[PDB]
């Protein structure tokens, strides 16, 4: 739930935005953190958080000029989609 120090909803949007725009290269640990985050809120049943983090991540990875964030997002998105297909059976409409 607590990712990059950020705990609250809009606190996550702000700090993870500044994170993706400053960092030009996410390491595998950074990628796995955001997978675990977007899986945690599925286990905490906060699909409002899923809605936010998916659509807003995409925005940030496109706001970042680096294609490494696009492949990072592709892996994170993929894994978290699968988690929703097992846990709920369906995914949130957002991509």
- CATH assignment of 1-95, given 3.40.50.150, 3.30.470.20, 1.20.58.1280, 2.40.30.20? 1.20.58.1280
Sign of CA dihedral 81, 87, 89, 94: negative
Q: How far apart are CA 51 and CA 26, in angstroms?
A: 22
Half-sphere exposure of 40 (CA within 13 A, CB side): 11
Mapped onto helix, strand or coil, the DSSP state of residue 41 is: helix
The technique by which this structure was obtained is NMR
Please say whether the beta carbons of 12 and 3 come within 8 A.
yes
What are the φ/ψ torsions at residue 63 (nearest 5 degrees)?
-70, -30
Burial readout 51-63 (b: 16 or more C-beta within 10 A, e: otherwise): ebbbebbeebbee
* Domain extent listing, the chain: 1-95
Query: What is residue 90's three-state secondary structure?
Result: coil
């Amino acid at each position: 739930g607590n990712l990059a120090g950020a705990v609250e909803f809009n606190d996550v949007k702000t700090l993870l935005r500044e994170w993706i725009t400053t960092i030009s290269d996410p390491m595998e640990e950074d990628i796995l953190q955001v997978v675990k985050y977007c899986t945690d809120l599925i286990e905490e049943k906060d699909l409002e958080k899923l809605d936010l983090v998916i659509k807003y991540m995409k925005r940030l990875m496109q706001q970042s000029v680096e294609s490494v964030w696009n492949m990072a997002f592709d892996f994170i998105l993929d894994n978290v989609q699968v988690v929703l297909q097992q846990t709920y059976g369906s995914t949130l409409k957002v991509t």
